Design a protein around this ligand. Sequence first.
Ligand SMILES: [Ca+2]
Length: 297
Amino acid sequence: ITLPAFHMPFQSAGCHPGLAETREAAWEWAAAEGLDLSVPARRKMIRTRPELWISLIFPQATQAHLDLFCQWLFWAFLVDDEFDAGRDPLMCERAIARLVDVFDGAAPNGPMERALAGLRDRTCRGRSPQWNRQFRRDTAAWLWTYYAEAVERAAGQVPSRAEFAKHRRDSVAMQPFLCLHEITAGIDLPDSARSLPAYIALRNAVTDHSGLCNDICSFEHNAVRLIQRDRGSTLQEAVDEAGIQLARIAERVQRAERELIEEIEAAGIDGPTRTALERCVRDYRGLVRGDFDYHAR
Ligand SMILES: [Ca+2]
């Protein structure tokens, strides 16, 4: 199987120079929180290289922000590892609802709960209720996608190609890091800016590209397999067709930027809101490219 020639018109924003430092801080954070990983889990985390993804997503971030975001990613990888109990819908329901309660303020218990509480304290405090509402929405949506997949698998139900794309937006967990971008970029989006049709299209296309690129570079429901199912093709035919669909998503990023600039000028958007939206127009390209260089390279 040969990967296709991807359509990548987005230039690179670089890689953070503190990649080695933020990895050492990530494992130093896991040890201080009592996160006891098994040997296969430790090998899996080293193989996944969370320091690489976070450094390609936030190359200009401060070291403190990069370390914090990396520990979120380190925590999210540990959450994903446990759910692939992980298939029993009754276990997933109690596990997810416990993590969300800890997020909402319930006193933590285990190491994963105290780690999440510490992550939420360092991140969510100081941010606006506008940001905390979107951050919880994206984080909780990602957590409940494990319950959704568990119940869907237990019922013998399979997702269509369209339903999986909507589900993949929350299950790729790129959106919670689009909220973290606001922190490292020094911006804050009002709900009016979040309601702009072109910003929604831009935020979703950035999320879709990350999800599909993930499935392509990783041979669980996979978009390439669903293409192979809905088209009855071989693996190489489904991989190239998946790459073509990714090219359309990259095209959606370009059209959403143009339409967002048009919506800024037409609506008379100025001040910090215009600065926050123009920051996303400039940065979301490098996020797509940074995520792409992680999965493909
Ligand atoms: Ca184009």
